[PDB]
Design a binder for these strands. Structure first.
Lengths: 46, 271
RNA sequence: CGCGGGGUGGAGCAGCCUGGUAGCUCGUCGGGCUCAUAACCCGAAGGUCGUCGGUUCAAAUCCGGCCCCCGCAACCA
RNA sequence: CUUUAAUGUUUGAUGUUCUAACGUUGACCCGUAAUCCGGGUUGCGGACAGUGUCUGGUGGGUAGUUUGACUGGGGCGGUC
RNA sequence: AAUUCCUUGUCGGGUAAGUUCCGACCUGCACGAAUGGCGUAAUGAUGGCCAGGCUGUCUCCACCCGAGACUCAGUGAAAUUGAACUCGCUGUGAAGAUGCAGUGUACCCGCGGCAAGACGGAAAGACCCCGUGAACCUUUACUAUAGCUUGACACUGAACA
RNA sequence: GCUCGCCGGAAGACCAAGGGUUCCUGUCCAACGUUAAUCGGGGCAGGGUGAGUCGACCCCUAAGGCGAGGCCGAAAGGCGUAGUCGAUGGGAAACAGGUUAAUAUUCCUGUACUUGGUGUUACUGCGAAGGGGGGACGGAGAAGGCUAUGUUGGCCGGGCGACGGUUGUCCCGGUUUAAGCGUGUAGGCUGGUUUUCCAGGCAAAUCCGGAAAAUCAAGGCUGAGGCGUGAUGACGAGGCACUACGGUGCUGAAGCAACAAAUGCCCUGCUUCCAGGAAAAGCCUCUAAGCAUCAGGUAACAUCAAAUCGUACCCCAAACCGACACAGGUGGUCAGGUAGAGAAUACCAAGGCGCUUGAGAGAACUCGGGUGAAGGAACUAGGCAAAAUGGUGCCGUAACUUCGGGAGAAGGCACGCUGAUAUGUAGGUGAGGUCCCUCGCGGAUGGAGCUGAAAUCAGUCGAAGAUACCAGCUGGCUGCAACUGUUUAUUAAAAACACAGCACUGUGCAAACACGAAAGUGGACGUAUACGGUGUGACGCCUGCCCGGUGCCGGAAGGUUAAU
RNA sequence: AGGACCGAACCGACUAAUGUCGAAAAAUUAGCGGAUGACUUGUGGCUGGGGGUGAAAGGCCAAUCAAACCGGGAGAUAGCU
């Protein structure tokens, strides 16, 4: 069937990426929380 | 002309093309063009402002000069040009100076006739001049409200304004709707009824005839659910509610006129 | 199984509601106008107010039995 | 006291005119190559319109709830 | 009649047999002229009926060729499950008994099969009812409110009829 | 390794995407593989990705995003100008051959091309965020000429063959060559050139546009492919030579003609129709503020530079997505032979595989199917399932109708092969020879060769000739919907929804309406033959009576009536 | 010319069997319907929780929709089991 996840990096990084997050007020709220739990993969990258 | 197409298939059974055998079948004059990426009927924040929009063929917005800001300069009509962005068809007219412009081709104006803009423009359809210079009882179009915008009233095909009177600084114009509004006498208007007045005779037949226009399918209210529409709902297929809009407005009878800063200008109400 | 209203000259309605006096159009009988009828004009009669009991200075009126009519009801898996 | 009459004086409701308030998604110019905008001229309206406060009406477009019980199952019916 | 309760209405046709169907009679419980009425060529993976054709759908199935089932070697789950030495019948009993009483019967243990029961297994019944539960939706249920609209005041001034 | 069998418009060969060493090599077997496993996409270790011409980064834009001031909003923040980003877009330039255990349009040999910097010589005026041209474009249809490619033949090389014929009209294999350059055809487009003048292109202008004159009839632009060159080069079958027995080294004949022919190219064409068919930069060119012993530009030449990143492998699947080595989903290019209209399909080529459990048994029963006496829907909710009809040309073809259809209606005749008309016809293409010439890729003419339907007649084979794969059941009545289409993805695909048409009604533009506390936008850069709301739903005949109630609209004299 | 006729790649999903702890958290097999159009589709954007979108089913918004998911109100309340 047509499964709901056909990956495409370009779409992904521009909708979940670092700059795609830092560009908003609520964005730094996320970077705050990801470091709050000390996680490593805060945003998708290489 | 109003071509009654021969019934070949149920679809070509009810289609009538408005084909004028004088149209330039070749590609038009480039320098007066401009693209126009359709909006899909959305506001700056993205939500749909009105339905039945979005789609159709790509259209090129040709920069038509309605303004007619040239004075005392003769011209020659080279060819009747077709434009998708209008019910009527514009005309590529060339002046003596070397400027080619697009206008609203009037009724009796073929490719080869002469026009002129200015206050000295004698009587002949297509000429732009002040209304106090224009003899009362005639027919005009492309009229403004204030000198300097271009022309709003009587713009689409087959539309005409009949100048009733010229009471002082205000002129009396009997519009197409029967609604009369006074306009400053310094206003400029172009003479003659707009040509290509056969568009109301156009019958489509094809459902796609509106689809390649850009118009989306128009649904009815007696089908939906109450959560998305004031109408809708029913097991025995009820209607039962007073005819309203998707926003509770008492339609099919309710004049929504409310501006007041311009209510000093409606002479006679639209009969 | 239930509920609401009604039952008034030959036909159909008033009066009841807030208790004495019973009205109207047509119709029945008759006279008259026309040669005849109809139509029209005029007068009188015609009502145990479905029925009995109770109670009240009056029973058509207030109330309780019996009979008749209209609408909905014969339901949910 | 009633009916009336000229005036001084104190306010209100209409008509018309006007321009400074204001509006201007009119022309034009400059900032500036720039359809935003601001300002400057001029034209067109005009103490309107518009916004704020308070207020009457409308108002399921929007929102928060109600929508009884006994019942030889419930409902109808009936009753408290 | 996608509408007619009664009803398989009545009549005629189609079959030897027609609660369906086709054409009509009007007694329309309760069609109706834009929540359009009556027809309508063409179109239709549409609903219903009939005929021809063609066939195992059927009278009644028969044989054969492959893939599993059966066997061997290897690998090796699953729902479920209080405890079990776990028979039928009659009756009684939280009201249909494998287990209680009476009684008949039955060597112990597997395989291949078929499915009546163990009110078998899966889903804390989606049905009826209840909770002074919830959820949206409706409106001439109550009260508010967006928005629209009216007026007073403010921004708002100058003069005369 | 020899056979068998499978797909072969794919289960093949290559790319984008997305993964991330799964590629290749050696070694190893507990764990992964639904089995065994010295095998592998498993563990350990080593190697491998070589670019001025490929893609991207880069230049410049679309939808749209963000966005100095600005406008606005409790704050957050929203919108948006100038700008700045963003391809699936446009914009410069390379192919063949050989080689590796694994990578090569990148490496090596050979043959070419592109944009810039400095310098040299000879000339000449150059110069913008400004202007013009170009870039630059739609669907469908048909035609002409070729190419990729295939077939036959000729020639060369080998064989003449384990059971009958086989030196002959026999058999098999090969017969391959690009980029660029020169020429610049078939074809298409368009009248060039010279002079003057001008409220035009926010200014200027020799560039463009316009109006009158002038001379002559072509010039110019563009353009697949062929032909030469590229190339006395490479490659190339088969021999010749050593085996770690996997392969390497050496050498090298023929290398063309004809026909058929694409969905490839000319074509970013032409005719025509309508729904009317991006933008900027690169590039060519004109000049402003200006600068002229200059700076720069044009042309020829020498030389230097062309960075960075990706580059392995998989890429219609055991490596992507589906928890799995999953009968599923996944864009684009190339795509041979015979029959066949065809990319259907059947059998084969190139190439890759037999699907990672099998050996016996042949019971019931289940599933996928074949066939079946006589009857032929008696089955059943119902002709559901199976069966049957199924191809080409011609003949013939009703009711009804909006005169298009209905209709491929129904129902029928002939279909193989061989010979003959004719040592394979009509037709197609077409060398040589000949003539002419404003000499080239020429025009007429001429006919060898090659290729190749169909119709008729005669004869013959079988029960059957569309003999297989492939491939319509038909007629009639009638309800509804007009029709194609759309929808409950994952139980309802229709009578529901839409539909064009019609009717009513709102809107005179800072339009209503709609999102948004506002600004700002869509509506529309449209303005009444228009736009939004609602109702019904092609076409034909028509669409009655009721203004009580509700709602709406118009008029407000009067009653009542909030704040002030 | 055709929302024209037959029928492949492509797209969809009417009928029936197989399957239902399956090959698979809606598929295969054999017939089907459209297939130059209201067409299909790759890539890259815009519109969002009382809102989006809708050829209008109360379908869809990551296998989850008469109001998605995550965390915080909140150890909500529970005359109930």
């Amino acid at each position: 069937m047509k499964r709901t996840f056909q990956p495409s990096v370009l779409k992904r990084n521009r909708s979940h990426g670092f700059r795609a997050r830092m560009a908003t007020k609520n964005g730094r709220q996320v970077l705050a929380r990801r470091r709050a739990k000390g996680r490593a993969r805060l945003t998708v990258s290489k | 002309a109003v071509v009654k197409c021969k019934p070949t298939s149920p679809g070509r059974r009810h289609v009538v093309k408005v084909v004028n055998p004088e149209l330039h079948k070749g590609k038009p004059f480039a320098p007066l063009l401009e693209k126009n990426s359709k909006s899909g009927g959305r506001n700056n924040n993205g939500r749909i402002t009105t339905r039945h929009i979005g789609g159709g063929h790509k259209q090129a917005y040709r920069i038509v000069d309605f303004k007619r800001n040239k004075d005392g300069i003769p011209a020659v009509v080279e060819r009747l040009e077709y434009d998708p962005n209008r019910s009527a068809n514009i005309a590529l007219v060339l002046y003596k100076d070397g400027e080619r412009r697009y206008i609203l081709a009037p009724k009796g104006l073929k490719a080869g006739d002469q026009i002129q803009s200015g206050v000295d423009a004698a009587i002949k359809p297509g000429n732009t001049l002040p209304m106090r210079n224009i003899p009362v009882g005639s027919t005009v179009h492309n009229v403004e409200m204030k000198p300097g915008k271009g022309g709003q009233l009587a713009r689409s095909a087959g539309t005409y304004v009949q100048i009733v009177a010229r009471d002082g600084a205000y002129v009396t114009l009997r519009l197409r709707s029967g609604e009369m509004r006074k306009v400053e006498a310094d206003c400029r208007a172009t003479l003659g009824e707009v040509g290509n007045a056969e568009h109301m005779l156009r019958v489509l037949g094809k459902a796609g005839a509106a689809r390649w226009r850009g118009v989306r399918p128009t649904v009815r209210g007696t089908a939906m659910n109450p959560v998305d529409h004031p109408h809708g709902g029913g097991e025995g297929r009820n209607f039962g509610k007073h005819p309203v809009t998707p926003w509770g407005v008492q339609t099919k009878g309710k004049k929504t006129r409310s501006n007041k800063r311009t209510d000093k200008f409606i002479v006679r109400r639209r009969s």
